[PDB]
Design a protein around this ligand. Structure first.
Ligand SMILES: [Zn+2]
Lengths: 150, 303, 53
């Protein structure tokens, strides 16, 4: 997206250019979210790495039954997030269970919001730097795309 | 294979059972409510008029299915006497299903009821066309399926004060509906479109007590609706009020036998039944919101 | 009542003015009541569809 926007800037246009850049950024976010739906059932793709110096979900009591699988955790802990009910959004240590896993639907909304925060940081920075715009870049997720996972 | 339908059975004399089913015997369920294709063809040849043809077919079917075998039975044997489908909030709605509950002060005939149903079909289709603008809805050919709860202590009607009806109509392609609020909004719009129909009001307005027909509270996660071909469980006595088809043929129907046979398809009266397309959907538009809490204009202005 | 008040008894030189009673009421309130009746208008005024392709 940044390549496309900065290549568009070469042709040169007034603030209309900033509006076009905003449209392109929104389109890119839409396409990313749409493509993230086909990977809604994969738990290792949505699992995030946690260091021993951060706050993590409490270890489920069933994770201590892994056996030889607990001998490979020394620094990183990969945790995915699943929704087993209304709004539970519990956390699952992916690497402490034998495969294949049988889990409820993944919480792709929470993971996608976490990723979109970082995406919007970069896009807002680009908009503020290349065109002098005080208007932050925000993407409507709960209004236009939150239905695909609920 | 999942998703699956989960039903809620009303056991006798008290208690509720649940049944999650991957497949079932629907041929046995809808058996004694079917008209042989030869009979349908003969009647169509006899009576060309579609109102008369529909009334004839309704009369013929009414006098065919005697009773679903009642008695005691455990949950496995009672799931064929009573059965309710539970609305699941994680799935999409492919049928518009309306639970009409009319209230009367004088008993209504059945020809008057058939005329009222023919008028209802006209306004609901206009509302649907307004709601789904990207689809080609033909008001004289779109299929709508009507079921009427049987009569218990041209077919006659012995109802007391209430005439329970179910209306099923597929969501126009390429549209899908998602959400419990969206379906409530769709029901609101359908009811408003119907109530504005001059012909329907003139034909049915005399006997009715109130003009609140479509119950829009049946669309909530976990709520259940009674399925066609199943009778209500009365702790007082036996089952009653089976929902059986009331054929209201479209004026421009080109395959009457297909329309008649489509009333026994379980895919036509389930909330989240897979849609019936032809080759494949190149694109589908999901209607995931229709506003929100409604209140009213008279309410907002007054507040 | 301020519109129908007169300060001169002479009918020709009277200070009466047209009353904006019916006009304001119709423009502000009774227009929307009739606008409701049309089904298309009803949908246009009491629904905000949201659809994703
Ligand atoms: Zn009856």
């Amino acid at each position: 997206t940044l390549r496309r926007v900065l290549g568009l800037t070469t042709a040169c246009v007034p603030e209309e250019d900033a509006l076009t850049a905003r449209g392109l950024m929104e389109d890119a976010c839409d396409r990313l979210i749409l493509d993230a739906f086909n990977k809604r059932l994969d738990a290792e793709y949505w699992s995030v790495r946690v260091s021993p110096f951060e706050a993590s979900d409490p270890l489920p009591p069933t994770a201590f039954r892994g056996g030889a699988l607990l001998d490979a955790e020394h620094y990183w802990r990969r945790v995915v997030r699943v929704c087993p009910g209304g709004g539970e959004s519990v956390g699952v240590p992916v690497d402490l269970y034998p495969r294949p896993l049988v889990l409820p639907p993944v919480d792709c909304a929470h993971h996608l919001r976490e990723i979109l925060r970082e995406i919007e940081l970069v896009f807002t920075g680009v908009l503020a730097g290349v065109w002098g715009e005080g208007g932050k870049f925000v993407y409507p997720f709960d209004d236009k795309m939150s239905f695909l996972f609920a | 294979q999942t998703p699956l339908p989960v039903y809620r059975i009303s056991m006798v004399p008290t208690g509720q059972a649940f049944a999650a089913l991957a497949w079932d015997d629907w041929a046995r369920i809808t058996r004694d409510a079917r008209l042989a294709e030869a009979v349908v063809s003969a009647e169509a040849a006899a009576h060309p008029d579609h109102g008369a043809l529909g009334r004839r077919l309704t009369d013929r079917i009414r006098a065919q299915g005697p009773v679903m075998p009642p008695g005691g039975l455990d949950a496995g044997g009672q799931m064929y006497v009573n059965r309710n489908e539970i609305f699941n909030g994680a799935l999409a709605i492919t049928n518009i299903i309306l639970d009409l509950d009319i209230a009367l002060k004088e008993p209504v005939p059945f020809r008057r009821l058939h005329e009222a149903l023919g008028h209802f079909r006209r306004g609901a289709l206009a509302a649907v066309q307004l709601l789904f603008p990207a689809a080609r809805v033909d008001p004289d050919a779109y299929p709508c399926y009507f079921f009427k709860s049987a009569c218990r202590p041209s077919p006659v009607c012995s109802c007391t004060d209430k005439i329970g009806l179910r209306v099923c109509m597929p969501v126009p392609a390429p549209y899908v509906v998602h959400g419990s609020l969206t379906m409530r909004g769709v029901a609101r719009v359908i009811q408003q479109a119907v109530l504005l129909d001059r012909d329907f009001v003139e034909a049915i307005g005399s006997y009715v007590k109130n003009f609140l027909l479509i119950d829009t509270g049946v669309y909530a996660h976990g709520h259940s609706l009674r399925l066609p071909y199943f009778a209500k469980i009365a702790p007082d006595g036996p089952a009653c009020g089976r929902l059986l088809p009331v054929f209201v043929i479209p004026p421009a129907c080109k395959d009457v036998p297909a329309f008649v046979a489509a009333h026994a398809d379980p895919r036509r009266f389930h909330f989240h039944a897979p849609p019936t397309y032809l080759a494949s959907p190149r694109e589908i538009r999901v209607l995931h919101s229709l506003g929100g809490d409604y209140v009213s204009f008279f309410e907002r202005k007054a507040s | 009542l301020r519109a129908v008040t007169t300060h001169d008894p002479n009918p020709a030189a009277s200070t009466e003015q047209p009353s904006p009673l019916g006009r304001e009421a119709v423009e502000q309130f009774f227009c929307h009541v009739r606008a409701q009746l049309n089904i298309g208008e009803y949908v246009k005024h009491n629904v905000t569809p949201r659809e994703t392709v």
